[PDB]
Write a protein that binds this ligand. Structure first.
Ligand SMILES: OC[C@@H]1O[C@@H](O)[C@H](O)[C@H]1O
Ligand SMILES: OC[C@@H]1O[C@@H](O)[C@H](O)[C@H]1O
Ligand SMILES: OC[C@@H]1O[C@@H](O)[C@H](O)[C@H]1O
Lengths: 492, 493, 140
């Protein structure tokens, strides 16, 4: 009982925008402080106050875009608090022990993006901010002439303006960003965006706040009232295994929790399909990007940690959620052009966890790093007929995607969602000229909650994958249980 | 500069419902009277009052469904006027150049016509000027197998057992000649009327709500949002009209600009179907509800000297291309479009048949339906294409292509060449085959841009064997004639 | 009714009992209309209870409902009141409780409230108080 797949290697169905592989860092818990920003004279080795171990890991992963500063924090932030002499910035401390000293602000974020080579994506404050304030932020960042804002930027140490495309006009406006009706947010959106200018040769890509989960009415109102004034519309969807008040743990979970988690993750396909169908009615040429800028798993925090800091472990279950979710974005790459997993470090479904100077790479990191070959690749036409798995055959056993990279290699990625047995897959390759050869890598575990710890940071990591044969133009593979695999094919 | 196509012969994308090949006959002009119904004692040879030359042609074409009685006539018709003893049927005669509706063709004659043809009946009830009880009683008259005044009347009138009928239109053209209704108002009437249309015995109704005219997307949105749970199908109406309303242009003797405009307006169907279907997707993402394109086709000025009210127009190779390209568009949308009905069957608009007393002819449109019948209930195959352009600014595709697999495993590939000036080279690669294949072909073409059939010369434009292709291995290279519709039949093994 | 009320045509249940409308469904239900308006009004008189009749909005007409009230309650000369007298009830009956349709959101026409409200307002307009009868109009 093999799954079967045909790849039409000569038939391109679209481009997987590299920004599908995006990330998100809020001023929350240890995502910014400790996770990234340590300060210049921290004993943690760093470049301009940003820790080097994280920088190198993220550069290796080819991080394409980073969204900051939130999240809920964005519609509470006043950006002027985070610029100027670092020592005189605004400080807040709540003992009920959270500290925001604003040492990481606009200059530090823009520097971080330059060091990583990624695009900045900033969310401005609609909920508690003013139109002038947001307009001035853009001017501060991008204007090259003389004005109070651009002069202030130069005094603060950046002589030439920066470039920025991605600009969120508020975030989470239906909830923590002002508890707004869609019709009211649409009006504020139209007003605020009006004053966000393109200075010099910078071109903004304005993004309106989109729906939470299955709020289709939100998407309809925003498209109907504001489509001509946006470049992009967001969408937020978290995979939460249990109920809100008892979500379940990141490790030590039951087999039922495995199946539920994956089934909830796959709901993304229905969401994206239905939101995109509404977008099609108002924007049939697909001008406007759909931006899935919050996704990932959300569990109860690790026992004994502060629930407000959202610290959770990351297992092979999380790797499968990431791999299957990225595949869903690939299938929707005609409309989805950016996505941002929540969140980068020490918060929710992170690629990295830190503990002082130590860090580890999660199983989620390994998926992003293995799948980077799909960034800006051409999606190829594939068709499939796959075994079922799970309690009632409710899940596909295998998720598969194929793309062609700019040097002509083909990458095929495969997730096996069953933790109990391996998955046979037969792949036929059509439309090739040459013969091809293949190598592979696989990420798997011997436990359903296999994870990395600071003491054992390499229990779950990629390994060479050799359990396939390629005879002519069939590639038959035996995927391990609970695994994510990538095959690289070279022609000639 | 060949157009290129790849057919994945092992990859099925959908089923082309046979009802895509449907037809439409209104009580208008000579579509019903003379076109079909001549009366039992006519010297025109006939079967129970229906002329035999038309019956045989329509059976050969494998007509799958026939919509009656309208059109605008349906929201004016009171069905009880069309049953019972012929001499007590309602009679209307207008001298203002003369028009007779004697109701000799009514419910029993229509159902007989469908049984003779082997096609499904599709009846449109009267919402605009009718009542809820009236429509309910029509369904009961036709379908109930028990005892009641309606079922007993049907038995008195000569049909003992009930008929089966699926397709039932709850009003027609309600935005215009069926009551000038706002969508919100129609949707409420629709919900009310449909409530009383019952499934008697083992009959199952397929209730169809009146859908949009052309690009009235608001109509589709309101009907889907207010009435989707109460319908099985939603209609759509789009005519290809070359010129303005007041001067549409002629069926023959037209300019080359009129050729290009005609075809470009026909292809607009694709955008309409796409956009209406997108709205349907929002409210019915599983595609339960059928899209029913129950009026389409060309509409020209009438033939000079004929009554404009009778809608009589000629039919040329231009009309064949419209039909072939439009059917291909329906194939591409066969995941949602499950019926279509070209307007109209005989002597009216884009007809398959024209008659003149006892003589008849088959139009170029007939030949397309008759050639493309191999696509009825076939499996649509995955094809991809990269085609030359044609027309003044390369605004048109030179070629339209569709492939399907029939129940016996043969593959049919149909191809339209939209350029009247030169032939079209097409290279087709076949993937996913086991055996070798061989191929035969037929083509419909003309030497003139307005080539048509007349009663004196009824065979100027008709299908012929097509041999101008080679099949080496799994490439099929073809040279399509100018202004042509072609079908290739491939047999494997 | 019930669902039957927005399918009933009251004229089917009056006149010589033997010539009333008959329906039979073998899939074995029989409606011979032997129990109609006169029989119901008699039943209420025998029991000493008030009659409460539901008229047909969903598949009925405004005139039909208006004529039902007139048939039952008018004491003068008209086609409806004369028909009542021929059918054996010389003086009119009294009736208060009159339902203007039933179950109109479902089996009585699958109506939106806003649409039923408009039909309600239209139908009720023509339900008159004849002689000393006073109707008590009930909306679904
Ligand atoms: O990952 C972001 C979390 O969810 C969002 O609602 C808030 O920013 C934070 O609480
Ligand atoms: O197809 C027939 C014409 O178009 C329809 O709209 C009317 O019935 C008639 O005038
Ligand atoms: O008691 C009445 C029942 O419920 C109502 O909906 C119908 O009249 C009948 O089916």
């Amino acid at each position: 009982v093999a799954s079967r797949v045909v790849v039409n290697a000569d038939r391109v169905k679209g481009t997987i925008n590299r920004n599908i592989y995006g990330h998100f860092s809020e001023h929350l818990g240890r995502c910014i402080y400790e996770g990234l920003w340590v300060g210049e004279d921290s004993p943690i080795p760093n470049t301009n106050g940003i820790r080097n171990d994280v920088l190198e890991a993220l550069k290796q992963m080819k991080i394409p875009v980073l969204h900051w500063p939130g999240g809920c924090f964005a519609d509470e932030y006043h950006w002027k608090d985070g610029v100027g002499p670092r020592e005189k910035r605004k400080r807040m401390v709540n003992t009920h022990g959270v500290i925001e000293n604003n040492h990481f602000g606009t200059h530090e974020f823009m520097m971080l993006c330059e060091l990583l080579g990624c695009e900045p994506y900033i969310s401005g404050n609609v909920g508690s901010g003013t139109v002038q304030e947001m307009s001035e932020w853009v001017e501060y960042i991008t204007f090259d002439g003389e004005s109070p804002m651009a002069n202030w930027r130069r005094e603060n140490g950046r002589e030439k303006p920066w470039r920025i495309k991605y600009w969120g006009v508020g975030n989470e406006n239906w909830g923590c960003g002002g508890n707004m009706r869609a019709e009211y947010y649409a009006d504020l959106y139209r007003q605020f965006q009006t004053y966000l200018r393109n200075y010099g040769d910078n071109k903004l890509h304005k993004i309106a706040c989109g729906a939470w989960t299955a709020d289709y009415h939100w998407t309809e109102v925003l498209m109907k009232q504001a489509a001509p004034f946006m470049h992009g519309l967001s969408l937020h969807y978290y995979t939460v295994p249990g109920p809100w008040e008892k979500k379940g743990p990141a490790t030590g979970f039951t087999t039922d929790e495995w199946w539920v988690t994956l089934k909830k993750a796959l709901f993304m396909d229905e969401l994206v399909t239905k939101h995109s169908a509404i977008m099609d009615v108002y924007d049939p040429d697909k001008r406007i990007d759909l931006i899935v800028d919050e996704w990932g798993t959300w569990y109860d925090v690790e026992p004994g940690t502060n629930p407000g800091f959202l610290y959770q472990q990351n297992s092979i279950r999380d790797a499968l959620v990431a791999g299957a979710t990225l595949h869903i974005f690939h299938r929707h790459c005609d409309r989805v052009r950016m996505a941002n997993i929540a969140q980068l470090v020490n918060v929710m479904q992170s690629v990295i966890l830190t503990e002082g100077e130590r860090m580890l790479l999660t199983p989620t990191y390994h998926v992003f790093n293995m799948f980077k070959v799909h960034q800006d690749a051409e999606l190829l036409d594939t068709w499939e007929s796959v075994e079922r798995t799970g309690p009632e055959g409710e899940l596909p056993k295998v998720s598969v995607s194929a793309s062609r990279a700019a040097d002509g290699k083909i990458h095929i990625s495969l997730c096996n969602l069953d933790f109990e047995t391996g998955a046979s897959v037969d792949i036929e390759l059509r439309g090739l000229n040459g013969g091809v050869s293949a190598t592979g890598t696989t990420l798997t575990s011997g436990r359903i909650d296999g994870h990395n710890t600071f003491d054992e940071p390499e229990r779950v990591k990629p390994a060479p994958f050799r359990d396939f044969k390629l005879e002519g133009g069939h590639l038959n593979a035996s995927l391990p249980p609970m695994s994510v695999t990538v095959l690289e094919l070279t022609a000639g």
